[model samples]
Target: HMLTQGELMKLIKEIVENEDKRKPYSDQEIANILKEKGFKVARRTVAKYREMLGIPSSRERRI
Candidate 1:
């Protein structure tokens, strides 16, 4: 079964929260963090999701 919208939001929340805690949300880092969070998301998936979340990509996030 596909994940619900709420689940998707939860995943996004998890990623953002982790990143906010000084985790730094890189494409690969988010993917790895998700894996550690039991999401098992792919790097590409993190990129897509980060896009969908309207969050900047790691490259764009650099100062």
Candidate 2:
């Protein structure tokens, strides 16, 4: 069962949008951030979700 209250897409998007462009957040970092925020996500899940959202990986997004 889904435990979170807010839309997870927003959470993911916010993390991607707010990260430092020069050093975009890694899948591990994104998963940890979500975990800290009570999402309890995994790194692979974050990576898949990011890809699902059409967002590039940190290496691809790096400025």
Candidate 3:
């Protein structure tokens, strides 16, 4: 069964929260992780979701 958008969004948040602050994951990397987790997420979709979650880009996240 496929995951819903809300479910995926929650997962995305969790992934971001647990990421290393000094070297945050990029949208593409996030998408890759989600794919490995069995979700068919894309980089653009990750970007959109990241924006919705108000998370900053990897560059800004770098310490």
Candidate 4:
């Protein structure tokens, strides 16, 4: 069965949280991170995920 947006969203939230557990995932870093976690995502795919999650790029992250 195809995953719903909500289901995909929950997966992404977990992915992001895992990334955050060590360090924030950058747009480029996202692809490898997802891949490492079995998410078969490309860089462009990562950008889409970021857009859906309303996450900004690394440059937008301020201390």
Candidate 5:
């Protein structure tokens, strides 16, 4: 089964929310995680969704 946009965004949010703040995942890392979970996501796609979700980049997230 495929995840809808909302579902994907939620999943991404959850992933980010539970991540280590000092070492947040990169867009590519998030994409890789999604891929491991069976989602066909790319780094660019993750970046887009992440931005839309109001999440920042890994560099900005570092504490």
Candidate 6:
């Protein structure tokens, strides 16, 4: 099953709105977080979505 746009976009917003660049969450962690919110997603899918959204990788996001 696929995530609804409203659900996906809201998650993306939560991720993209983090205040700490030096400690940004990793894609795997994002997947975990989403799972906690009942959004069953894989780390790979999170990577793809993060790229599609133009968000940098966790390593690059770190200060």
Q: When superposed on Cα atoms, how far off is each prediction in RMSD?
A: 3.2, 2.4, 2.3, 3.5, 2.3, 2.3
Against the hidden reference, what TM-scores do the models get?
Answer: 0.59, 0.72, 0.75, 0.56, 0.77, 0.72
Tell me which of candidates 2 and 3 scores higher on TM-score: 3
Question: How many clashing pairs in candidate 3?
Answer: 0
In model 2, the clashing pairs are none
lDDT of 6 at 21: 60
5 against 6, candidate with superior lDDT: 5
CA-lDDT, candidates in order: 0.62, 0.72, 0.75, 0.59, 0.75, 0.70
Per-residue accuracy of model 3 over 1-63 as CA lDDT, tens digit each: 256856667777687767776667878888888889777788888788787877766557565
* Cα lDDT tens digits for candidate 2, 1-63: 354443455567676778776777777888888888778877777777777777877667675
Candidates sorted by lDDT, descending order? 5, 3, 2, 6, 1, 4
Whole-model lDDT for model 1 versus the true structure? 0.62
TM-score-better candidate, 1 vs 5? 5
Residue 61 displacement (Å), model 4: 4.0
Screening candidate 4 with a backbone cut-off below 3 angstroms (N, C-alpha, C), the clashing residue pairs are: none
* Preferred candidate (TM-score higher): 2 or 6: 2
Model 3 C-alpha RMSD vs. true structure (Å) is: 2.3
| Candidate 5 ranges beyond 4 A from true positions | none
Give the Å error, residue 7, model 6.
2.1
The candidate maximizing TM-score is 5
Worst 10 residues of 6 by lDDT: 6-15
